[PDB]
Amino acid sequence: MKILFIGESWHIHMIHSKGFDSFTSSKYEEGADYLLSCLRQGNIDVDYMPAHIVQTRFPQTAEALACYDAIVISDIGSNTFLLQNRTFYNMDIIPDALQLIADYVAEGGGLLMIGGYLSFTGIEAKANYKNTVLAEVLPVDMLDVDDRVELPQGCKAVNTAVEHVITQPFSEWPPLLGYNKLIAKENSQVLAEINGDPLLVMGTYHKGKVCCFASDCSPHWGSPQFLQWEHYATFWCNVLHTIKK
Amino acid sequence: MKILFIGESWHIHMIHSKGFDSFTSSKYEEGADYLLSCLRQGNIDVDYMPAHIVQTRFPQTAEALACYDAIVISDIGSNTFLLQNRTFYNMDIIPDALQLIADYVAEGGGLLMIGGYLSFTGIEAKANYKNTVLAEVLPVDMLDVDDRVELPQGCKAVNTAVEHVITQPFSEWPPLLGYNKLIAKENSQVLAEINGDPLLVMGTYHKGKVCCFASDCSPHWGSPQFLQWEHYATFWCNVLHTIKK
Amino acid sequence: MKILFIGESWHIHMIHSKGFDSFTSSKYEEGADYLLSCLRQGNIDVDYMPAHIVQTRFPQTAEALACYDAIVISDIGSNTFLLQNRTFYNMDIIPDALQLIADYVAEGGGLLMIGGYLSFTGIEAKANYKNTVLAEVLPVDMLDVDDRVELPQGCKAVNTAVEHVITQPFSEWPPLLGYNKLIAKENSQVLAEINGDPLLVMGTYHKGKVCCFASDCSPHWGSPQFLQWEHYATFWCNVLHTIKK
């Protein structure tokens, strides 16, 4: 399978102040190289699209997205898709990128949204997906408020009574350090739950298959133990295959 | 016809980062200056009040606003009214400025609010007009959440079935690139809709007339095509004459 | 009486810009220094715990907090408790600090929360306590949206019919410049109100006593009329004695 994987490294800008004075330091954080590694190890052929490309070169055509068996959006807020540089800084007229994605799913394409601070509703409600059009595509309902459920203690998920390829191979989950609180839509399937809330949900949107994972595939919610985990590489591949065109 | 126009230029402070290092550049983005000239070309005598002046020398009396036939508020959030330098840095007691505006309208004042990231509920719910004395003055209900509807692809508003002098001269709107999502109150008149939502809303507040335009008069929601439109200047002049005292 | 007092000074970072260029200046505001000097000298033994001490060395066992009669949280967001440095930057696993306070209170410890921008729901909803274990502990329900009610004109609180030790010695309040808007829960007693909303709410959490004060013990809501009040010091001492474990 061929997938489009949309994600990015956090940029970090650090102001250091003492008394009157300040200096800065800056750096980056590294996204999901590990998850991308795992996906290349499994069958999967991946096109990584960083947030920068999305902002500057996002495809303007359904056909441009047709060769992908599935799309993944990992911890990028909607603003990034809706306020591309040409829209925000030039006032060119540009296709709704999110509508393209939703159109692409309706024709059989698969979609996976992976949680984090910039997923679903997100920290300070900045991911803001509920107000988008994708809302209608996801097998979940989102909150109005900041989404995060922070779990410094850690908390481990339990699989669901539902039996599924993704979830068959294992039973004990590794600790996760948080997730986006979601509500499952009526006719969707919850495969695991965390702190009583849903963790993995599947639904369809017309012809296409949709999946939400409510925690992050990486730090800090995706704990060292979760990245470690014997089942991590295959879990992710199964999910991808479960939504294949 | 004599009006008080409250608005401003955006200030932009830009942090450029690469590896360890940053440098910064700064500029101003240019506000409603186009609209101001247009009003001046019609009847209208305009007192331009920048948010700087709102912050330092806002009138302390609703009699001081009384020489104005209307007050326009353009994409300036409530914080700017409620947290004048006196109040916020010095704890000096002063009249709630939104209340003076409310009083002013009640005694027959016109009020226009023009949308943007800092109108109504606003980007990230920052403009925050809902939790404000002005919420009952306006002919609209507002969302608890981030208001914005972004239309990178643009969207042409339509005139409603209500007939009006404002909307009389033209049938077809130029595209706009976003608007605040609002709900028309009961006794209010919707003259135009965009994307199935109210664009232009007239109502009353005791003896005063009130208007809500849900998009922006400037970039980036205000498309160039909007700005260059043969009707733009007469539309805004009309809107003002309409809400005159 | 020995209490844990949790708060901080504001750090201020200032970007000054003019045309292209900027420079910066930075400083500190001030925490509850007055209020602390007031609590001591009313023979209250006070451990001051700055955020930062919260962020690096926060008690991780029940035994640790047990030697405290009450805990004071003043103007500190939930993020500071949940996202300590070791969770957020180190990827360690530490226990939920707010479970800790909850546990403590249930075991008969007293809690006081003082309002401000990072209390309750807080400014731009950042304090975020409603999506938190403490929500359950507090004698108030919190809003989904931005909590603040700004009162630049100031408003005098009025005592309630309920007779109480805290409330006897005065009847007229000095003006406050804003507060967090809350709603009293059922089994809870409101001892004072401001602008027709709760200001002093008393309650219990299993074996423990809880108190919410809806305004700030310091600037800018905490007016100079409030700090120079005759009843100021005694008022807080009484609040504390009222929640002594």
Domain boundaries, chain B: 2-245
Is the separation of the CB atoms in B135 and B110 below 8 Å?
A: no
**C-alpha distance from B114 to closest chain A C-alpha (Å):** 19
Rg, Å, chain B Cα set: 18
Amino acid at B220: H
Q: Can you tell me the distance from the alpha carbon of B63 to that of B66, in angstroms, rounded to the nearest whole number? A: 5
d(C-alpha C39, C-alpha C107), whole Å: 24
Q: What experimental approach yielded this model? A: X-ray
Strands of C148-159's sheet in order across: C45-50, C2-7, C70-74, C110-114, C208-213, C197-205, C189-194, C148-159, C172-180
Structure tokens at C62: 């029940």
Token pair in block for residue A140: 């979940």
- Topology of domain B2-245, CATH: Rossmann fold (3.40.50)
| Residue A220 preceded by cis peptide, ω within 30 | yes
Whether C125 and B125 lie within 8 Å, measured CB to CB: yes
Count of CB atoms situated within 10 Å of the CB of A129:
26
Cβ proximity of A147 and A116 under 8 Å: no
- Taking the C-alpha atoms of residue A214 and residue B184, their distance in angstroms, rounded to an integer, is 36
- Whether the Cβ atoms of residue A60 and residue A95 lie closer than 8 Å to each other: yes
Record the resolution, in angstroms.
Answer: 2.6
Q: What residues in A contact C26, CB-CB < 8 Å?
A: 17-22
Name, in order, each residue with C-beta under 8 angstroms of C116's C-beta and a sequence gap of 6 or more.
Answer: C74, C75, C122, C180, C215, C216, C218, C221
Nearest to C96 among A18, A148, A152 (CB): A152
Structure tokens at C106: 């249930």
Residues 6+ apart with CB under 8 A from A117: A75, A123, A127, A148
Specify whether the CB–CB gap between B125 and A124 falls below 8 A. Answer: no
Distance from CA of A184 to the nearest CA of B (A): 21
Asked if residue B134 lies in contact with residue B97, where contact means CB atoms within 8 angstroms, the answer is no
**CA A38 – CA A183 distance, rounded (Å):** 29
- C-alpha to C-alpha distance for B75 and B58, rounded to whole angstroms: 17
- CA–CA separation, C101 and C76 (whole Å): 14
C neighbour chains, 3+ CB pairs within 8 Å:
A, B
C-beta of residue A207 within 8 angstroms of C-beta of residue A165: no
B181–C contact, CB cutoff 8 A: no
Q: Is the dihedral of CA A140, A145, A149, A150 positive or negative?
A: positive
Q: C67 burial class (0-12, 13-18, 19+ CB within 10 angstroms)?
A: exposed
Measured from the Cβ of residue C16, the count of other Cβ atoms closer than 10 Å reads 11
SS3 C191: strand
**Residue in chain C nearest A29 by alpha carbon:** C89
* Burial grade of B101 (CB within 10 A; 0-12, 13-18, 19 or more): buried
Interface check for A24 against chain C (CB to CB < 8 A): the answer is: no
HSE value, Cβ hemisphere, 13 Å, CA-based, for B42: 20
Name all contacts of B201-207 with Cβ < 8 Å and 24+ positions apart: B201/B139, B201/B140, B202/B139, B202/B164, B202/B242, B202/B243, B203/B138, B203/B139, B203/B140, B204/B139, B205/B102, B205/B105, B205/B106, B205/B111, B205/B136, B205/B137, B205/B138, B206/B105, B206/B106, B206/B107, B207/B106, B207/B107, B207/B108
CB A144 within 8 A of CB A182: no
Q: Is the dihedral of CA B108, B112, B117, B118 positive or negative?
A: negative
Cross-chain Cβ contact C151/B96 below 8 Å: yes
